[PDB]
Each structure stands twice: as structure tokens, then as C-alpha cells.
Design a binder for this molecule. Structure first.
Ligand code: HEC
Length: 107
């Protein structure tokens, strides 16, 4: 979707997550290079067993389902957040996050 627009939806996430150059782990783990990565693998982040042992691979479709209702997808997750219900917002959000490489540089 529209990355400029996803940047604004990302503000809800920024409180707990970093993205971009120099991103560091906070309440939540860095989101650089998210798509394609296996859940619970950012080094130095203390993941819940619920996330670490889930066996999830972060594809766009799986991100989509998770973000609408995190607790429904990963019961017991430390990510206590109501989710993003709006379809367009999710599509924008995806566009924004997809811009980043694992190192925080922009594709
Ligand atoms: C604090 C109140 C959070 C907000 C707001 C958002 N996230 Fe989050 N996120 C948070 C925690 C504590 C964790 C770890 C969960 C655990 O159970 O260990 C997470 C995790 C994620 C993940 C999975 C990451 C992985 O490496 O597997 C994703 C994909 C994720 N968070 C995305 C995300 C987005 C897109 C948000 C904005 C809508 C967002 N989170 C908000 C804490 C918090």
C-alpha cells in the first residue's frame, strides 16, 4: 500500500518497537527485516514462550491475521495490544515495514 500512510499507523507501534537505522530492542523487539523471519529470533530480546515456540514464520498473510488480534493468534503473548482492525491501515502498515532491511537501511 502507501508507505507514507503506513508510517503514521506505525506511531502506535513506535512506543514499543524501533525500526530504521540504529534500531535497538525496547519493550518489543526491533522490526527491521520482519517479513520472512521466524518468530522469536531477534538476539537479545526476551520473548515469551508463547511467541518463541509458536513455529510462526512472518509472511504478510500471517502478519495480517496476527495484527488484527494478537492474543487470538499467539495466546499468552507479552504484546498486550488490541490490534489494528482497519484493512487499509494494515495494508499501509505492511508497505511501511517492508521498506526496511534487517540492518535498518531502506531498500
Ligand atoms: C507495547 C504495548 C507494544 C505495542 C504498542 C506493539 N507491540 Fe509488537 N510486541 C510487543 C512485545 C512485548 C512483543 C514480544 C511478544 C512476546 O510474546 O514475546 C511484541 C512482538 C511483536 C511481533 C513479533 C516479533 C517477533 O520477533 O516474532 C510483531 C510482528 C509485532 N510485535 C508487531 C507490532 C506492530 C506492527 C505493532 C503496531 C501496530 C505493535 N507490534 C505494537 C509490544 C508491543
Amino acid at each position: 500500500q502507501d508507505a507514507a500512510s503506513g508510517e503514521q499507523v506505525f506511531k502506535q507501534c513506535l512506543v514499543c518497537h524501533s525500526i530504521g537505522p540504529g534500531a535497538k530492542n525496547k519493550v518489543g523487539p526491533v522490526l527491521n527485516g520482519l517479513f520472512g523471519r521466524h518468530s522469536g529470533t531477534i538476539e537479545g530480546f526476551a520473548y515469551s514462550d508463547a511467541n518463541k515456540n509458536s513455529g510462526i514464520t512472518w509472511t504478510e498473510e500471517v502478519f495480517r491475521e496476527y495484527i488484527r488480534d494478537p492474543k487470538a493468534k499467539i495466546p499468552g503473548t507479552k504484546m498486550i495490544f488490541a490490534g489494528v482492525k482497519d484493512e487499509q491501515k494494515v495494508s499501509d502498515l505492511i508497505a511501511y515495514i517492508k521498506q526496511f532491511n534487517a540492518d535498518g537501511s531502506k531498500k
